[PDB]
Amino acid sequence: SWLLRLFESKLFDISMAISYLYNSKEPGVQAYIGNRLFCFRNEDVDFYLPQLLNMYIHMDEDVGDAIKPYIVHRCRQSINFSLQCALLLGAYSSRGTKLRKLILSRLAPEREFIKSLMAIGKRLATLPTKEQKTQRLISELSLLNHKLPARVWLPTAGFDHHVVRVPHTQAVVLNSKDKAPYLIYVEVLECENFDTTSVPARIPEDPSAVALKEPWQEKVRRIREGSPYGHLPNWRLLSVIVKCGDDLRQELLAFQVLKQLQSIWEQERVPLWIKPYKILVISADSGMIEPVVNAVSIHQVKKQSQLSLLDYFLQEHGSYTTEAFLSAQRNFVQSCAGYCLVCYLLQVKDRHNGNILLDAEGHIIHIDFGFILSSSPKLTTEFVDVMGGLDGDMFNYYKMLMLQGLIAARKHMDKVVQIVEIMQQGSQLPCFHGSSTIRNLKERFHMSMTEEQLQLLVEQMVDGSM
Amino acid sequence: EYDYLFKVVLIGDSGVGKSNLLSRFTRNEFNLESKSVEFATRSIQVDGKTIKAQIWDTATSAYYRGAVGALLVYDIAKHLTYENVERWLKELRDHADSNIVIMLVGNKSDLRHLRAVPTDEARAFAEKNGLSFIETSALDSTNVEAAFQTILTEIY
Numbered sequence A: 001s002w003l004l005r006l007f008e009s010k011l012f013d014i015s016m017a018i019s020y021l022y023n024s025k026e027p028g029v030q031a032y033i034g035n036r037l038f039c040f041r042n043e044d045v046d047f048y049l050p051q052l053l054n055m056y057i058h059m060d061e062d063v064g065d066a067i068k069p070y071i072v073h074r075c076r077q078s079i080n081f082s083l084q085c086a087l088l089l090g091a092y093s094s095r096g097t098k099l100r101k102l103i104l105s106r107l108a109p110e111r112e113f114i115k116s117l118m119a120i121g122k123r124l125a126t127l128p129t130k131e132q133k134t135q136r137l138i139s140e141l142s143l144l145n146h147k148l149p150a151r152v153w154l155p156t157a158g159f160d161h162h163v164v165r166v167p168h169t170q171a172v173v174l175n176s177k178d179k180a181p182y183l184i185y186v187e188v189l190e191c192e193n194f195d196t197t198s199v200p201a202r203i204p205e206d207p208s209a210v211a212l213k214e215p216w217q218e219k220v221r222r223i224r225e226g227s228p229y230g231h232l233p234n235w236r237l238l239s240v241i242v243k244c245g246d247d248l249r250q251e252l253l254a255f256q257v258l259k260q261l262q263s264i265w266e267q268e269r270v271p272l273w274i275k276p277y278k279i280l281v282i283s284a285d286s287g288m289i290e291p292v293v294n295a296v297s298i299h300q301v302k303k304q305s306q307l308s309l310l311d312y313f314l315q316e317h318g319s320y321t322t323e324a325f326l327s328a329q330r331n332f333v334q335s336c337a338g339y340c341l342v343c344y345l346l347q348v349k350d351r352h353n354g355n356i357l358l359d360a361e362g363h364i365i366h367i368d369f370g371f372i373l374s375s376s377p378k379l380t381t382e383f384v385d386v387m388g389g390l391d392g393d394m395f396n397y398y399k400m401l402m403l404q405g406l407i408a409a410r411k412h413m414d415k416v417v418q419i420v421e422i423m424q425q426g427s428q429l430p431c432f433h434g435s436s437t438i439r440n441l442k443e444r445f446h447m448s449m450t451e452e453q454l455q456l457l458v459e460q461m462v463d464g465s466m
Numbered sequence B: 001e002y003d004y005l006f007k008v009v010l011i012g013d014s015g016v017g018k019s020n021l022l023s024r025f026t027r028n029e030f031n032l033e034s035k036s037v038e039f040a041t042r043s044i045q046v047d048g049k050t051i052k053a054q055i056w057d058t059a060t061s062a063y064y065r066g067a068v069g070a071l072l073v074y075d076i077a078k079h080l081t082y083e084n085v086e087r088w089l090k091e092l093r094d095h096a097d098s099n100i101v102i103m104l105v106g107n108k109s110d111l112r113h114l115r116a117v118p119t120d121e122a123r124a125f126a127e128k129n130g131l132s133f134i135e136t137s138a139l140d141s142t143n144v145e146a147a148f149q150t151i152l153t154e155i156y
């Protein structure tokens, strides 16, 4: 019984537990794994929730019933976990429909908060301009404060809390599209546990109702001073982008791959920088997003200042001799190389300075992970300059990070491919158009190649990226 | 030499692990992977006596011919297996020896988080029919030998 020696072993984690539960056709093995789930940490299993729930819906019934006991147990404990399941079950369904209707059978206050937000975004289809929508949006969101606080929370927050106030004057529509997305600021009060504390107390000219483009720290202090709940130490401000007409399912998949890639490089001690933003799937056509603070598109940086990338760096950080620019440049190099490997492995397309952000530190951040892998309808000179030319000592450091980054990427390619391979199960997503999408994913790792041949791959990859 | 040769039988819905109980008690081995009539024997000492226990396993009347003890093995992770105990009882009433010691067995007790059968309600059913009760687990050998040790000791 070597197999039992493996499960009994310390080498048995949640990742491999999903591996055997995904391949094994042995009822005794499946039911056993369904029991070991209770032994794992709640946090470690949550990451593979989109995987588990997806296996539950688009696989053999003998597989779903094995996970059901663990899922029900966690739903009975966490109201948030109950919400997460009800959203994922209906989002990937096109079996768990009979389960979603009982989990929701308490969550009334929360569900009402989601429908309201999505409804607000929908009505903004009449206002043809970005300015008109924001005008109606702010007035629309001002109505929500008339029914707060309440048993409502932002799932994107890394803690328990109660939504108390909504600074509508700070909200705004992002673009002039039909079902245009809108960013909102939400004031919340943290707590020990959501399923423990009751809804907090409620408390009600030309002060803080001013909308400016400023840093996070300064935009929170203003909203704080104009907020009735701004005197409690429990107070904290969050922000989420509401998309009432976009499918954030592929966005969720890309997120997991980023976190996995982020861990691998962190465990292999490779100084690569990438910033995965939290995603929340409400349906197969909606969802929210938590935008990273103090970051704007490069296109919006070249436009507001009318400069080059290197110019904005020297102006906002300092001269080449300044230590501040050195750190800012190092953050740029590590962020580029980090996201270059992300674009190659995932095959991220539609890459432009509108989907590429830039934070205060100097890191770059890719967004909009549509057109990845199969789905579909570059190192610009502007970037190469910031690294000190093609023969700059920092550019060679950039090519080195991709090498030892790709090397460490092969040392854990198993854990990464698992994320995408499982999600392809029954999904009608455009990123799974080709019959053999997983094969190209594995071959892009090049396990067969050697390190001597990897450098040639890295070198020939950078050249073609121009 | 061995004193006597008992003939106990293992019945129940397929998948409860009566085939694994047979391997754990005798040869002391358990495998998660499954395969598929068969019997295995192992002699134990009971009251200063040597008894060669002849455990039978299936996948009818010939099965019950010479049957000394009965082991109803149900799964605690599948309530349907506990529901069919009444059907297996009728299976015993019709072909089995009129004076066989039936010891109820709740296997797979290691699946603590997937329990579908209450340990107190199942044990109560053992009192309603005056049958011996015990929950085992062929995976970690919990009360495995104790099960047959009792069923063979109670046969006197």
Ligand SMILES: Nc1nc2c(ncn2[C@@H]2O[C@H](COP(=O)(O)OP(=O)(O)O)[C@@H](O)[C@H]2O)c(=O)[nH]1
Binding pocket: A026, A027, A028, A029, A031, A032, B013, B014, B015, B016, B017, B018, B019, B020, B031, B032, B033, B034, B035, B107, B108, B109, B110, B111, B136, B137, B138, B139, B140
């Ligand atoms: N978790 C767990 N699984 C068990 C236990 N006993 C048996 N099994 C599983 O049950 C499955 C079927 O058992 P099997 O030998 O076919 O019993 P049979 O159907 O009555 O012949 C096997 O794959 C075992 O892995 C136990 O105590 N715990």
Ligand SMILES: CNC(=O)CNc1cnc2ccc(-c3ccc(OC)c(OC)c3)cc2n1
Binding pocket: A174, A181, A183, A241, A243, A246, A251, A277, A289, A290, A291, A292, A293, A295, A296, A297, A357, A367, A368, A369
């Ligand atoms: C309101 N504009 C800003 O806040 C500028 N700064 C930031 C900072 N982090 C971001 C993270 C994610 C996204 C994002 C991701 C996916 C999207 O759809 C595929 C999307 O389209 C609504 C936006 C934008 C971000 N923008």
Ligand SMILES: [Mg+2]
Binding pocket: B019, B020, B034, B035, B036, B059
């Ligand atoms: Mg068998």
